[PDB]
Design a protein around this ligand. Structure first.
Ligand SMILES: N#Cc1cncc(NC(=O)Cc2cccnc2)c1
Ligand SMILES: N#Cc1cncc(NC(=O)Cc2cccnc2)c1
Lengths: 304, 304
């Protein structure tokens, strides 16, 4: 028992972290096979970041201008290319610690672990979620760019995020491993505001099921509701609308606890209308939306 | 910016995890050099756990009865001994992935990362704290015993916890790497109640400084207090008494923000007396006590 914001073991990702330097700019890179992936703004000076033309900036760069260090040793760069907002630096050595991996573009509401890195070295690991406004609420300082977000299925690492920037609001924006930004963000030092941060409803419901499994049952009520009635409440509280797909994915949690999804929705509805009244659920005084139904099942069953 | 419950990168610890089987009981072990450390209740059957005599139970066990598997390969056990509540299984091969390590017994209030494991395989990593009642609020299921808690200084892993049990209250109890339990717990299937769970005051104060650094300043007030006045409030709210040692360790955070420690104590006092009034601090609706002053500085400066 007990429920924690748990990250995947980071070992397979630590073995992929390198340092990329271009001129006076140093950030993190991800070395998989003979390719090093990093944000393209590594070629920029703070003056360039105001309005950068990456195609023109890259013309003045050769393979020898990209310095890639893996731990203590230097990698030889034999190729360089730009794919959307990431640079792919072909090196002459395959990473001997390359795990089985995939590049996946996640949907908003999905969760992932972040391995925060500085100068190619890992500093920490934490669990995150791609928000419905396509930002992440991470913990990154200057130098953390190139840090990656990922998921793990037994021995396969699915890379889903690469950190590029921090918005003036303290929230973070980044790309998938093909260099496409999540959301409308551009890799430019220009004011970019994030849209409405809505609550991931299916994840809060998954977390209420995790609380029921762990003994926290005070919020269970004698009521039920419908998808349309629940969504009227969800809209009012800036919650994501619940669909039959969401109900379907909550099926195993509903089966394990014997609490129908629409019944759990009615508990959530009352919690939204009345608040927690000074109580806590899984040691939290607010409704947690950064655990997917998959995360709850995984943690509650011990998937390694 | 951003502040997260961040765990240390787990790679160095993943390379130490093995599976230990004795009879029909399987739990986790920690392989460092030529020694495998695991909870001694691995020699018990569920019948034995009611009232076990480990010295008598160990008499019926030989080196060949302890099965140690590292990944997919079997380790040869050439020695076995009991040190307090852990078994040390001498194996014929030194772990080639043994990092620089220490065994440290932590004080209550101190934090550590846990690598939850099942059948010698890591499932997840999370940040934890040794509570003042010597329990941890972890996330462990049956099979997680032998999972370890640790801290990391550059390349050195300080092992501080080994998980042994879950109390009927859903909180966890365990030992240091010399087999001594934290708190008064015994490795027996007998009802053991934890004492009062008090709040780690110096850690809440460290977290208020992290919130000030990250932009959350609403709780800052026009007041100050004294150590004796603050502690009258702290006692009333089951908070740990604050000492000059605590004030001393908050010195770098006080210097960085320019907010005197006693001033931050007065903000904490008002937060305790008035509550958050529906507001949040670092995305939390309660006062977080599982970040030490060291954790705040580390995360806010990017120590790798
Ligand atoms: N793409 C892009 C891009 C555009 N403008 C500025 C930057 N730089 C940062 O945001 C650095 C930073 C600072 C704190 C946390 N995470 C990152 C990058
Ligand atoms: N020492 C000891 C000891 C005494 N009595 C019972 C056990 N077993 C467990 O608590 C197994 C377990 C279950 C869930 C989470 N963590 C562990 C061990």
């Amino acid at each position: 028992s007990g429920f924690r914001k748990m990250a995947f073991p980071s070992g397979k990702v630590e073995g992929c972290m390198v340092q990329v330097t271009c001129g006076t700019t140093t950030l993190n890179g991800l070395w998989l096979d003979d390719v090093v992936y990093c944000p393209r703004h590594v070629i920029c000076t703070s003056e360039d970041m105001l309005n950068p033309n990456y195609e023109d900036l890259l013309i003045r760069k050769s393979n020898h201008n990209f310095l890639v260090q893996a731990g203590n040793v230097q990698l030889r760069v034999i190729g360089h290319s730009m794919q959307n907002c990431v640079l792919k630096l072909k090196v002459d050595t395959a990473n001997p610690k390359t795990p089985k991996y995939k590049f996946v573009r996640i949907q908003p509401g999905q969760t992932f672990s972040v391995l925060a890195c500085y100068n190619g070295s890992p500093s920490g690991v934490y669990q995150c979620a791609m928000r419905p406004n396509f930002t992440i609420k991470g913990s990154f300082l200057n130098g953390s760019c190139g840090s990656v977000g990922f998921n793990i299925d037994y021995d396969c690492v699915s890379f889903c995020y690469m950190h590029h920037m921090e918005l003036p609001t303290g929230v973070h924006a980044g790309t998938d491993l093909e260099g496409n930004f999540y959301g409308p963000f551009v890799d430019r030092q220009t004011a970019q505001a994030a849209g409405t941060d809505t609550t991931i409803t299916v994840n809060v419901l998954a977390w209420l099921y995790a609380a029921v499994i762990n003994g926290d049952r005070w919020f269970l009520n004698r009521f039920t509701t419908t998808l349309n009635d629940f969504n009227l409440v969800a809209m009012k509280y800036n919650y994501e609308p619940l669909t039959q797909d969401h109900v379907d994915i909550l099926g195993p949690l509903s089966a394990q606890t014997g609490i129908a999804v629409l019944d759990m929705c009615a508990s959530l509805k009352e919690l939204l209308q009345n608040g927690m009244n000074g109580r806590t659920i899984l040691g939290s005084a607010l409704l947690e939306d950064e655990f997917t139904p998959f995360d709850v099942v995984r943690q509650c069953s011990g998937v390694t």
